[PDB]
Design an enzyme around this catalytic site. Structure first.
Site, PDB file in Angstrom:
ATOM      1  CG  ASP A 180      -2.174   0.799   1.007  1.00 23.84           C
ATOM      2  OD1 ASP A 180      -2.279   1.456  -0.028  1.00 23.84           O
ATOM      3  OD2 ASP A 180      -2.966   0.900   1.931  1.00 23.84           O
ATOM      4  CB  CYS A 214      -5.523  -1.262  -4.476  1.00 24.78           C
ATOM      5  SG  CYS A 214      -6.118   0.410  -5.093  1.00 24.78           S
ATOM      6  CB  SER A 215      -6.873  -0.657   0.360  1.00 26.61           C
ATOM      7  OG  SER A 215      -7.725  -0.425   1.537  1.00 26.61           O
ATOM      8  N   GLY A 217      -8.984   1.473  -4.382  1.00 27.45           N
ATOM      9  CA  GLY A 217      -9.394   1.485  -5.786  1.00 27.45           C
ATOM     10  C   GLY A 217      -8.802   2.694  -6.548  1.00 27.45           C
ATOM     11  CB  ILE A 218      -7.659   5.838  -6.063  1.00 21.61           C
ATOM     12  CG1 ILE A 218      -7.160   5.991  -4.589  1.00 21.61           C
ATOM     13  CG2 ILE A 218      -9.208   5.993  -6.174  1.00 21.61           C
ATOM     14  CD1 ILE A 218      -7.629   7.324  -3.978  1.00 21.61           C
ATOM     15  N   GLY A 219      -4.877   4.175  -5.865  1.00 22.65           N
ATOM     16  CA  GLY A 219      -3.415   4.289  -5.941  1.00 22.65           C
ATOM     17  C   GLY A 219      -2.760   3.189  -6.766  1.00 22.65           C
ATOM     18  NE  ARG A 220      -2.178  -1.068  -2.986  1.00 24.44           N
ATOM     19  CZ  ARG A 220      -2.283  -1.833  -1.879  1.00 24.44           C
ATOM     20  NH1 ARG A 220      -1.456  -2.858  -1.685  1.00 24.44           N
ATOM     21  NH2 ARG A 220      -3.162  -1.546  -0.933  1.00 24.44           N
ATOM     22  CB  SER A 221      -6.729   0.663  -9.017  1.00 21.69           C
ATOM     23  OG  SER A 221      -7.192  -0.263  -7.959  1.00 21.69           O
ATOM     24  CD  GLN A 261      -4.244   8.387  -3.412  1.00 21.87           C
ATOM     25  OE1 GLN A 261      -4.110   8.656  -2.229  1.00 21.87           O
ATOM     26  NE2 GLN A 261      -4.764   9.218  -4.281  1.00 21.87           N
TER      27      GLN A 261
HETATM   28  O1  LIG Z   1      -4.969   0.546  -1.886  1.00 22.48           O
HETATM   29  C1  LIG Z   1      -4.310   1.591  -2.512  1.00 22.48           C
HETATM   30  O2  LIG Z   1      -3.485   1.390  -3.339  1.00 22.48           O
HETATM   31  C2  LIG Z   1      -4.855   2.965  -2.190  1.00 22.48           C
HETATM   32  O3  LIG Z   1      -5.093   3.803  -3.094  1.00 22.48           O
HETATM   33  N1  LIG Z   1      -5.146   3.096  -0.886  1.00 22.48           N
HETATM   34  C3  LIG Z   1      -5.568   4.298  -0.223  1.00 22.48           C
HETATM   35  S1  LIG Z   1      -5.870   5.715  -1.136  1.00 22.48           S
HETATM   36  C4  LIG Z   1      -6.335   6.503   0.407  1.00 22.48           C
HETATM   37  C5  LIG Z   1      -6.192   5.688   1.491  1.00 22.48           C
HETATM   38  C6  LIG Z   1      -5.733   4.371   1.096  1.00 22.48           C
HETATM   39  C7  LIG Z   1      -5.388   3.202   1.921  1.00 22.48           C
HETATM   40  O4  LIG Z   1      -5.263   2.084   1.495  1.00 22.48           O
HETATM   41  O5  LIG Z   1      -5.264   3.543   3.184  1.00 22.48           O
HETATM   42  C8  LIG Z   1      -6.634   6.012   2.889  1.00 22.48           C
HETATM   43  C9  LIG Z   1      -7.539   7.229   2.832  1.00 22.48           C
HETATM   44  N2  LIG Z   1      -6.895   8.304   1.930  1.00 22.48           N
HETATM   45  C10 LIG Z   1      -6.698   7.972   0.500  1.00 22.48           C
END
Ligand SMILES: O=C(O)C(=O)Nc1sc2c(c1C(=O)O)CCNC2
Length: 297
Positions: A180, A214-215, A217-221, A261
């Site tokens: 993450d 992902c968790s 749905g934005i960073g990894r995805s 992210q």
């Molecule tokens: O799973 C990811 O790649 C991802 O975008 N995760 C994110 S984006 C995000 C968070 C998380 C997380 O997992 O804590 C926590 C709340 N702020 C934005």
């Protein structure tokens, strides 16, 4: 060239400014359905919501809301659904969406536990003989088989609509060594995993959109989808220098917020598309090299 740009960026040490520049320019559309009171327990993170214009609606009359968006890449001719890690009350809604949207594949880029927290529900069966039944949306889900590599696993899952008794095969591609807020271990191991997904047929336009999560749905995805699309755009044209990665990312951010992210994940995407360009431009032998490099076995 993205590669010359990569070099400027790196040389001037300004991945953070570049990335900030993208965040500043990214689209801001309403997410009023996401923020309705009744949907509060359907959203894992208060600051990650589907825009109204692109959200996936469940084909149910009670409450059609899921935290998920359709990323439709017009030029590239590929769509994805990006969604958060299902919550313990929305696993039924997740498989409802997989069914109604006709997806063939689900790409999972996180583990259920990360950084000491539960980042996602255990929303798929881990042994053949203990299937899952989602009573609210009236679906059964069975583990049919699983291919465990060192850093990813591929599962064939059977999804039954318990009403009609229709049955569908879903493939699940579980990347388990992408942290993450982090990056894959190398371009090779990410590209090797991406090409597993492609080769499976799940991104074929005869299926509904692949589901990527992902968790949040934005960073990894976001990172996964940006690399995929950039490689497909270059494939369509056989012209790597026509591809403008940041502009591709801004176009994807029209359909869901927050895609990629951190600045290093942006950096990572350039690396992945630059290496991937080798395959697109006619050396398929690099694919074997990725496989070896990623020690899959
Ligand atoms: O799973 C990811 O790649 C991802 O975008 N995760 C994110 S984006 C995000 C968070 C998380 C997380 O997992 O804590 C926590 C709340 N702020 C934005």
């Amino acid at each position: 060239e993205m590669e010359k740009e990569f070099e400027q960026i790196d040389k001037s040490g300004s991945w953070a400014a570049i990335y900030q520049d993208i965040r500043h320019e990214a689209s801001d559309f309403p997410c009023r359905v996401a923020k309705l009171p009744k949907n509060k327990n359907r959203n894992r993170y208060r600051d990650v919501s589907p825009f109204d214009h692109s959200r996936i609606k469940l084909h149910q009359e009670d409450n059609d809301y899921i935290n998920a968006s359709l990323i439709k890449m017009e030029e590239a001719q590929r769509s994805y659904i990006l969604t958060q890690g299902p919550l313990p009350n929305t696993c039924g809604h997740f498989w409802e969406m997989v069914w109604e949207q006709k997806s063939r594949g689900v790409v999972m880029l996180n583990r259920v536990m990360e950084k000491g927290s539960l980042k996602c529900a255990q929303y798929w069966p881990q042994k053949e003989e203990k299937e899952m039944i989602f009573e609210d949306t009236n679906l059964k889900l069975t583990l049919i088989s699983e291919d465990i590599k060192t850093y990813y696993t591929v599962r064939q899952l059977e999804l039954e609509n318990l009403t009609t008794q229709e049955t569908r095969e879903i493939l699940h591609f579980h990347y388990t060594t992408w942290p993450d807020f982090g990056v894959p271990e190398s371009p090779a191991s990410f590209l090797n995993f991406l090409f597993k997904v492609r080769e499976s047929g799940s991104l074929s336009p005869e299926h509904g959109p692949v589901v990527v999560h992902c968790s949040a749905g934005i960073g990894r995805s976001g990172t996964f989808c940006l690399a995929d699309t950039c490689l497909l755009l270059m494939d369509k044209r056989k012209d790597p220098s026509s591809v403008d990665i940041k502009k591709v990312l801004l176009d994807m951010r029209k359909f869901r917020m927050g895609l990629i992210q951190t600045a290093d994940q942006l950096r990572f995407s350039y690396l992945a598309v630059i290496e991937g360009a080798k395959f697109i431009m006619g050396d398929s032998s690099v694919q074997d090299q990725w496989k070896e490099l990623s020690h899959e076995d």
